[PDB]
């Protein structure tokens, strides 16, 4: 007997999963959205941890505003709202390098969508961290209203984007690139952390004191 509230996906909280001892794990439990078909509980425990690492109140900003992560096992442009992605280049690659097929995560709508077992840089992707990079997409743009636009932001993104990101174009050359890529570091380690505080001291500010910069 299965139910249609698991036919497309379990929200966390409904899934059995024990994330007792993840810090957060009460808001979390609303946010994520993990397989109703067999995954791997390491994979999704550390995205999940991972997740836990954000400030308490971004996270609840994140689900009052109803933004989903959706963790997959499939690719996305198995899913019905990204078929129309299946065998094509993605914007920015050369035709042939890559297409959305090999792309495992998609962030900036109220659903975000992360493959399982792609977090680490290179992995399809140019990120130190998938899921807290595409997460901040989401919250950059519905969250805080696109706040890479804003003039602060712009003139960090100017000053420090080439101190930090001198050798990775697209962090250094897009803004909203700079925005995810710098909460990620920002939040996957203390290590990261520290190095954005010493290549970009401005940018680690903003991004610590995000929360009150909502709308
Ligand atoms: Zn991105």
């Given at each position: ?11 966390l909280e409904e899934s059995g999963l024990d994330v007792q001892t993840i ?38 900003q994140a689900a009052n505003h109803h933004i989903y992560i959706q963790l ?144």
């Amino acid at each position: 007997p299965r139910g249609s509230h698991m036919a497309h996906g379990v929200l966390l909280e409904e899934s059995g999963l024990d994330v007792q001892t993840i810090p957060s794990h009460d808001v979390l439990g609303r946010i994520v959205i993990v397989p109703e078909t067999d995954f791997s509980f390491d994979e999704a425990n550390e995205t999940i941890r991972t997740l836990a690492r954000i400030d308490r109140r971004i996270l609840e900003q994140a689900a009052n505003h109803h933004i989903y992560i959706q963790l997959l096992t499939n690719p996305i442009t198995d899913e019905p709202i990204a078929r129309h992605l299946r065998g094509k280049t993605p914007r920015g690659y050369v035709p042939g390098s890559k297409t959305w097929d090999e792309v495992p995560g998609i962030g900036g709508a109220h659903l975000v969508l992360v493959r399982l077992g792609h977090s680490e840089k290179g992995k399809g992707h140019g990120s130190i961290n998938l899921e807290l990079h595409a997460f901040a997409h989401s919250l950059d743009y519905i969250v805080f209203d696109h706040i890479h636009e804003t003039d602060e932001f712009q003139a960090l993104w100017r000053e420090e984007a080439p101190q930090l990101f001198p050798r990775e174009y697209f962090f250094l050359t897009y803004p909203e690139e700079y925005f995810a890529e710098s909460f990620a570091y920002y939040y996957v380690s203390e290590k990261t952390q520290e190095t954005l505080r010493m290549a970009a001291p401005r940018t680690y500010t903003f991004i610590r004191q995000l929360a009150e910069r909502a709308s």
